[PDB]
Amino acid sequence: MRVLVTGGAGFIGSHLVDRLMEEGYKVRVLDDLSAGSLKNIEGWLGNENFEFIKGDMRDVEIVSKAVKDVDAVFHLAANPEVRIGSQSPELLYETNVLITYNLLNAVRNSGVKYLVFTSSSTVYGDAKVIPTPEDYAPLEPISVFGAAKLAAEALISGYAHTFDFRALIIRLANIIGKRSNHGVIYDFINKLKANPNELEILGDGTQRKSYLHISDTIDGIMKLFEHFLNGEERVDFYNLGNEDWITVKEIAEIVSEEMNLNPRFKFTGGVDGGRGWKGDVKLMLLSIEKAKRTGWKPRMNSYEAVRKTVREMLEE
Amino acid sequence: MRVLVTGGAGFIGSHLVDRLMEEGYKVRVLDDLSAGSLKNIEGWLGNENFEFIKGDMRDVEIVSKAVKDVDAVFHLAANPEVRIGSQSPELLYETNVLITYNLLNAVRNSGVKYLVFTSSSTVYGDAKVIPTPEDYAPLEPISVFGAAKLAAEALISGYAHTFDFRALIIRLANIIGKRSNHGVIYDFINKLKANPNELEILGDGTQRKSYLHISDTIDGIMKLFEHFLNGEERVDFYNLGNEDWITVKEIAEIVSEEMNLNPRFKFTGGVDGGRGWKGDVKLMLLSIEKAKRTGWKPRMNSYEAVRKTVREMLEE
Ligand SMILES: NC(=O)c1ccc[n+]([C@@H]2O[C@H](COP(=O)([O-])OP(=O)(O)OC[C@H]3O[C@@H](n4cnc5c(N)ncnc54)[C@H](O)[C@@H]3O)[C@@H](O)[C@H]2O)c1
Ligand SMILES: NC(=O)c1ccc[n+]([C@@H]2O[C@H](COP(=O)([O-])OP(=O)(O)OC[C@H]3O[C@@H](n4cnc5c(N)ncnc54)[C@H](O)[C@@H]3O)[C@@H](O)[C@H]2O)c1
Ligand SMILES: C[C@@H]1O[C@H](OP(=O)(O)OP(=O)(O)OC[C@H]2O[C@@H](n3cnc4c(=O)[nH]c(N)nc43)[C@H](O)[C@@H]2O)[C@@H](O)[C@H](O)[C@@H]1O
Ligand SMILES: C[C@@H]1O[C@H](OP(=O)(O)OP(=O)(O)OC[C@H]2O[C@@H](n3cnc4c(=O)[nH]c(N)nc43)[C@H](O)[C@@H]2O)[C@@H](O)[C@H](O)[C@@H]1O
């Protein structure tokens, strides 16, 4: 089966690429290398089952070309950074709504049979139902990013129904692990790289979120892809997160523990009642019962995932 | 209070404009007249409280100017035609997501406190729960149009939370009445103008939908707007439709009745099981309990509204 993996040079994208290549898929990657890295996939450069394309999905010619002779598309290309939503909503609109729109228009005029899209928990915004099921609503995202992911979901479904392809929407929790160049663990480790004595923590440290290690993330993505191929649903929605959650302050504590530092915590106090930023959901914990009915389940919890991530990262 | 009404030269927009002028609002209209007409609002030209701006919302300067010195925005500008979704998805993308995105970017740099958006039942797609409540989900629109409307909703919510304005999203059912230049009644009347002996009905004729007369529609929009001004929700969702529904075949029968014709109905059999087109939802009926708790209620049911619309149209 031939698959396009947009953003396949990214953190999650390159791991999905490793998995797909190892299972014998013929994998093309489409990535402008604005945030991913060629190194993250240099092992596959030169494999006869691997093709790489440096390309911006804003460019429709590129996107029509990349989906040509592809049976499945895994659309992971995006700017995932919620932080930049209050300064750079245009960037989030483009790299979430626009490039997905172009991908779908390309998909319409091709033989692409399956579209797997990595949406986010942020579509629920500050969800009042915990653990949050996939049918929670009304969806009132509080960040430009979550709104852009919701819009991507909507357009994916509409094109799937109108132009007769199948679509699998996977709302991911916080995903952490080796090769990640963004997030709170990364930033804590590098802040302490620059100064071991203090840790500037955005917000009040009480933000509690579900963290999944990238290993469980890819196992679950593949399990859902497997089940979805065997299923009949035109469009299917799954949450993908861990069973529990952990606070920003506890994450700072684990990162300090693993770095053998004991710095002075300095919280910025946040906004909208201690959020790290405008649109930073304070509580997130996804109901993964629907995902677990496929056989998947995380082998690590949020605390284990965070600690393993810190270790893996400090090796590099 | 000064309010902008984008698309205010349209069917629903021009009636909303009439209403706003009569209640003493200061009304600016922004409309490129791609589907509306100056006739529909030329009656107000020369009033000290009325300003009209001919402009396409794709142009960001136009929209930035229009929200200048406006306290509330009624964003009715769009292409509402679902039928063209499989032919012209780019057009729906532009006139639903793009110009909504531009309006929102304009609103961020303004003093607009309230944004009211005319969403559609199509966001629910083929809803499996009927009457469909505002919290039905997962939202899986089956049309490019419904997907674009949902994406617009998402961006509205995200920007409302991020940049501190409030948003009222009103999911309208099928709206019918004077000045309507689209829909099934319009097309059936013109079909029988060209040939009174026969009527081509798209689909299998069993499509059952909730119709609201434009009078009830504007009464409800104003009730909801006032109540929303009195409420605390940063973003609030309301259905706006009738209590009942009616099939396309009964609408054909009523149109024949009022035209004193009795033609031969010829149903085209449709697609995807008798739909009028790719992405045409077959059954629609929104739960209006939430709308009715504001005091609003339709004075006409679907059959009365359809008959009133046909009569009004035939006077012209
Ligand atoms: N990391 C998480 O915690 C997390 C959580 C939930 C959802 N997700 C989603 O999973 C997916 C993968 O995220 P990630 O952590 O691997 O991020 P990433 O930025 O590391 O990977 C995304 C890739 O997209 C590429 N890209 C950016 N703009 C592009 C464009 N215009 N055209 C082509 N390629 C472009 C980047 O260069 C990068 O290689 C995204 O959809 C993200 O929103 C991530
Ligand atoms: N008619 C219905 O049954 C119905 C149902 C649900 C929702 N809605 C929504 O209500 C609103 C009004 O629909 P309507 O029936 O009055 O349609 P309409 O076309 O009569 O009115 C929409 C207006 O948008 C204007 N417009 C179109 N493209 C524009 C652009 N690029 N820039 C600026 N203005 C532009 C048109 O000229 C028109 O005046 C729309 O948002 C529509 O999607 C309508
Ligand atoms: C659900 C996922 O959310 C992901 O964002 P997101 O949760 O903020 O994930 P992070 O950026 O890791 O931030 C997680 C939490 O840690 C807080 N935090 C505290 N200090 C810091 C710091 O120094 N840096 C950062 N970055 N955070 C910090 C942050 O505000 C939030 O409460 C997205 O990247 C994905 O695309 C996806 O949307
Ligand atoms: C909910 C609202 O739905 C509205 O569309 P939508 O339901 O198709 O409303 P109409 O365009 O009126 O079509 C209503 C039903 O009548 C069918 N139909 C049968 N024959 C005809 C015909 O000759 N012409 C037309 N036009 N329809 C016909 C049509 O496919 C559908 O099943 C949108 O205009 C609004 O923006 C909003 O989305």
Short mmCIF file of N, CA and C in Angstrom, two decimals, chain A residues 123-204:
data_model
loop_
_atom_site.label_atom_id
_atom_site.label_comp_id
_atom_site.label_asym_id
_atom_site.label_seq_id
_atom_site.Cartn_x
_atom_site.Cartn_y
_atom_site.Cartn_z
N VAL A 123 -9.92 20.89 20.04
CA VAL A 123 -11.23 21.12 19.44
C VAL A 123 -12.29 21.18 20.53
N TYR A 124 -12.09 20.46 21.64
CA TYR A 124 -13.03 20.53 22.74
C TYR A 124 -12.86 21.80 23.56
N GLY A 125 -11.74 22.50 23.40
CA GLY A 125 -11.50 23.67 24.22
C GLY A 125 -11.45 23.28 25.68
N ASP A 126 -12.06 24.12 26.52
CA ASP A 126 -12.24 23.79 27.94
C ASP A 126 -13.46 22.89 28.09
N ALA A 127 -13.25 21.60 27.81
CA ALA A 127 -14.34 20.63 27.85
C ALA A 127 -14.83 20.43 29.28
N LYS A 128 -16.14 20.52 29.48
CA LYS A 128 -16.72 20.37 30.81
C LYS A 128 -17.00 18.92 31.18
N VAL A 129 -16.88 17.99 30.24
CA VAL A 129 -17.08 16.57 30.51
C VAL A 129 -15.71 15.92 30.54
N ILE A 130 -15.40 15.26 31.66
CA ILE A 130 -14.10 14.65 31.85
C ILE A 130 -14.31 13.24 32.39
N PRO A 131 -13.72 12.19 31.77
CA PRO A 131 -12.92 12.19 30.54
C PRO A 131 -13.80 12.59 29.35
N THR A 132 -13.26 13.33 28.38
CA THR A 132 -14.07 13.90 27.31
C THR A 132 -14.29 12.87 26.21
N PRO A 133 -15.54 12.51 25.90
CA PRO A 133 -15.79 11.60 24.78
C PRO A 133 -15.71 12.32 23.44
N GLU A 134 -15.61 11.52 22.37
CA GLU A 134 -15.54 12.08 21.02
C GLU A 134 -16.83 12.78 20.60
N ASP A 135 -17.94 12.50 21.28
CA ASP A 135 -19.22 13.11 20.95
C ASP A 135 -19.55 14.32 21.82
N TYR A 136 -18.59 14.77 22.63
CA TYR A 136 -18.78 16.00 23.39
C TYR A 136 -19.11 17.17 22.47
N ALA A 137 -19.99 18.05 22.94
CA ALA A 137 -20.45 19.18 22.15
C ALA A 137 -21.39 20.05 22.98
N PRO A 138 -21.63 21.30 22.58
CA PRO A 138 -21.10 22.00 21.40
C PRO A 138 -19.60 22.23 21.49
N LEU A 139 -18.88 22.06 20.38
CA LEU A 139 -17.44 22.26 20.35
C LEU A 139 -17.16 23.76 20.29
N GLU A 140 -16.59 24.30 21.35
CA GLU A 140 -16.33 25.73 21.49
C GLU A 140 -14.84 25.89 21.77
N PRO A 141 -14.00 25.67 20.76
CA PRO A 141 -12.55 25.83 20.97
C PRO A 141 -12.22 27.25 21.37
N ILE A 142 -11.25 27.38 22.27
CA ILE A 142 -10.88 28.67 22.85
C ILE A 142 -9.56 29.19 22.32
N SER A 143 -8.92 28.48 21.39
CA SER A 143 -7.68 28.90 20.78
C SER A 143 -7.86 28.93 19.27
N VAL A 144 -7.14 29.85 18.61
CA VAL A 144 -7.13 29.86 17.16
C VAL A 144 -6.69 28.50 16.63
N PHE A 145 -5.71 27.88 17.31
CA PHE A 145 -5.23 26.58 16.86
C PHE A 145 -6.34 25.53 16.90
N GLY A 146 -6.98 25.36 18.06
CA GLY A 146 -8.03 24.36 18.16
C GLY A 146 -9.14 24.59 17.16
N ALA A 147 -9.47 25.86 16.93
CA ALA A 147 -10.47 26.19 15.91
C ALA A 147 -10.00 25.77 14.53
N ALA A 148 -8.71 25.99 14.22
CA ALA A 148 -8.19 25.61 12.90
C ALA A 148 -8.21 24.09 12.72
N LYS A 149 -7.91 23.35 13.79
CA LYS A 149 -7.99 21.89 13.74
C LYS A 149 -9.43 21.43 13.57
N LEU A 150 -10.37 22.10 14.24
CA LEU A 150 -11.79 21.78 14.08
C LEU A 150 -12.24 22.04 12.64
N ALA A 151 -11.83 23.17 12.08
CA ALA A 151 -12.13 23.48 10.68
C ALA A 151 -11.55 22.43 9.74
N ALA A 152 -10.30 22.02 9.98
CA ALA A 152 -9.72 20.94 9.20
C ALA A 152 -10.57 19.68 9.28
N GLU A 153 -10.97 19.30 10.50
CA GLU A 153 -11.86 18.15 10.65
C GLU A 153 -13.10 18.29 9.79
N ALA A 154 -13.75 19.46 9.87
CA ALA A 154 -15.01 19.69 9.18
C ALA A 154 -14.83 19.55 7.68
N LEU A 155 -13.82 20.21 7.13
CA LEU A 155 -13.59 20.13 5.69
C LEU A 155 -13.22 18.72 5.27
N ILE A 156 -12.41 18.02 6.08
CA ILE A 156 -12.08 16.63 5.75
C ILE A 156 -13.35 15.81 5.61
N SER A 157 -14.26 15.94 6.59
CA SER A 157 -15.49 15.15 6.55
C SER A 157 -16.34 15.53 5.34
N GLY A 158 -16.48 16.83 5.09
CA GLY A 158 -17.30 17.27 3.96
C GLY A 158 -16.78 16.76 2.63
N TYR A 159 -15.46 16.85 2.42
CA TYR A 159 -14.87 16.33 1.19
C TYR A 159 -14.98 14.81 1.13
N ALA A 160 -14.83 14.13 2.28
CA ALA A 160 -14.97 12.69 2.30
C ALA A 160 -16.35 12.27 1.82
N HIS A 161 -17.38 12.96 2.30
CA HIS A 161 -18.74 12.61 1.90
C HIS A 161 -19.01 13.00 0.45
N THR A 162 -18.57 14.20 0.04
CA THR A 162 -18.92 14.69 -1.29
C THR A 162 -18.17 13.94 -2.39
N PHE A 163 -16.87 13.69 -2.19
CA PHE A 163 -16.02 13.12 -3.23
C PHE A 163 -15.59 11.69 -2.89
N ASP A 164 -16.32 11.03 -2.00
CA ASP A 164 -16.27 9.58 -1.82
C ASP A 164 -14.85 9.06 -1.55
N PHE A 165 -14.25 9.55 -0.47
CA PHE A 165 -13.17 8.83 0.20
C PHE A 165 -13.50 8.68 1.68
N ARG A 166 -12.72 7.84 2.36
CA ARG A 166 -12.92 7.58 3.78
C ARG A 166 -11.89 8.36 4.59
N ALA A 167 -12.31 8.81 5.78
CA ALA A 167 -11.50 9.71 6.59
C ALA A 167 -11.53 9.27 8.05
N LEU A 168 -10.35 9.22 8.66
CA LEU A 168 -10.17 8.83 10.05
C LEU A 168 -9.57 10.01 10.79
N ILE A 169 -10.33 10.59 11.72
CA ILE A 169 -9.91 11.78 12.46
C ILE A 169 -9.49 11.34 13.86
N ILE A 170 -8.26 11.66 14.24
CA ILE A 170 -7.68 11.18 15.49
C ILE A 170 -7.33 12.39 16.33
N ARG A 171 -8.09 12.62 17.40
CA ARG A 171 -7.88 13.76 18.29
C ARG A 171 -6.85 13.34 19.33
N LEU A 172 -5.62 13.80 19.16
CA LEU A 172 -4.51 13.40 20.02
C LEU A 172 -4.41 14.26 21.27
N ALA A 173 -4.03 13.63 22.38
CA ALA A 173 -3.66 14.34 23.59
C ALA A 173 -2.26 14.93 23.39
N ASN A 174 -1.62 15.41 24.45
CA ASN A 174 -0.23 15.82 24.35
C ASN A 174 0.65 14.61 24.07
N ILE A 175 1.40 14.65 22.97
CA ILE A 175 2.29 13.57 22.57
C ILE A 175 3.72 14.05 22.79
N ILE A 176 4.51 13.23 23.47
CA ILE A 176 5.85 13.60 23.88
C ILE A 176 6.79 12.45 23.57
N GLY A 177 8.05 12.78 23.30
CA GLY A 177 9.03 11.75 23.07
C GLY A 177 10.21 12.25 22.27
N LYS A 178 11.08 11.30 21.94
CA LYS A 178 12.30 11.57 21.20
C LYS A 178 11.98 12.26 19.88
N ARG A 179 12.80 13.24 19.51
CA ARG A 179 12.72 14.06 18.30
C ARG A 179 11.75 15.24 18.42
N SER A 180 11.05 15.39 19.54
CA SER A 180 10.16 16.53 19.72
C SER A 180 10.98 17.80 19.93
N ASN A 181 10.74 18.82 19.10
CA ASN A 181 11.39 20.11 19.26
C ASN A 181 10.43 21.18 19.76
N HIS A 182 9.31 20.77 20.37
CA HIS A 182 8.37 21.72 20.94
C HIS A 182 7.73 21.10 22.17
N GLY A 183 7.06 21.94 22.94
CA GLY A 183 6.33 21.52 24.12
C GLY A 183 7.04 21.94 25.40
N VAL A 184 6.41 21.56 26.52
CA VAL A 184 6.82 22.06 27.83
C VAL A 184 8.04 21.31 28.35
N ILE A 185 8.15 20.01 28.05
CA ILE A 185 9.30 19.24 28.49
C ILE A 185 10.56 19.73 27.78
N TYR A 186 10.48 19.83 26.45
CA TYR A 186 11.58 20.38 25.66
C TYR A 186 12.02 21.72 26.20
N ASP A 187 11.07 22.63 26.39
CA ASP A 187 11.42 23.99 26.80
C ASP A 187 11.98 24.02 28.21
N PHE A 188 11.48 23.18 29.11
CA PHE A 188 12.03 23.14 30.46
C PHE A 188 13.48 22.68 30.43
N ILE A 189 13.75 21.61 29.68
CA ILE A 189 15.11 21.07 29.62
C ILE A 189 16.06 22.10 29.05
N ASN A 190 15.64 22.82 28.01
CA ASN A 190 16.56 23.79 27.40
C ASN A 190 16.71 25.06 28.24
N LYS A 191 15.64 25.51 28.90
CA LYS A 191 15.78 26.61 29.85
C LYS A 191 16.78 26.26 30.93
N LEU A 192 16.73 25.03 31.44
CA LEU A 192 17.71 24.61 32.44
C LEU A 192 19.07 24.33 31.82
N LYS A 193 19.12 24.08 30.51
CA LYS A 193 20.40 24.05 29.81
C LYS A 193 21.08 25.41 29.92
N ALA A 194 20.30 26.48 29.75
CA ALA A 194 20.88 27.82 29.79
C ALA A 194 21.15 28.30 31.22
N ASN A 195 20.31 27.90 32.20
CA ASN A 195 20.51 28.27 33.60
C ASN A 195 19.99 27.21 34.55
N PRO A 196 20.87 26.52 35.30
CA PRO A 196 20.39 25.48 36.23
C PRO A 196 19.72 26.01 37.49
N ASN A 197 19.78 27.32 37.77
CA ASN A 197 19.36 27.85 39.06
C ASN A 197 17.88 28.20 39.15
N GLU A 198 17.23 28.49 38.03
CA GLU A 198 15.84 28.93 38.04
C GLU A 198 15.09 28.26 36.90
N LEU A 199 13.78 28.15 37.06
CA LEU A 199 12.90 27.63 36.02
C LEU A 199 11.69 28.55 35.91
N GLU A 200 11.63 29.30 34.82
CA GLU A 200 10.50 30.17 34.52
C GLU A 200 9.37 29.29 33.99
N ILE A 201 8.28 29.22 34.74
CA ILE A 201 7.14 28.37 34.41
C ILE A 201 6.00 29.27 33.97
N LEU A 202 5.49 29.04 32.76
CA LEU A 202 4.38 29.83 32.24
C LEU A 202 3.08 29.38 32.90
N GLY A 203 2.32 30.33 33.44
CA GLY A 203 1.10 30.02 34.16
C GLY A 203 1.33 29.87 35.65
N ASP A 204 0.40 29.16 36.29
CA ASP A 204 0.46 28.90 37.72
C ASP A 204 0.89 27.47 38.07
#
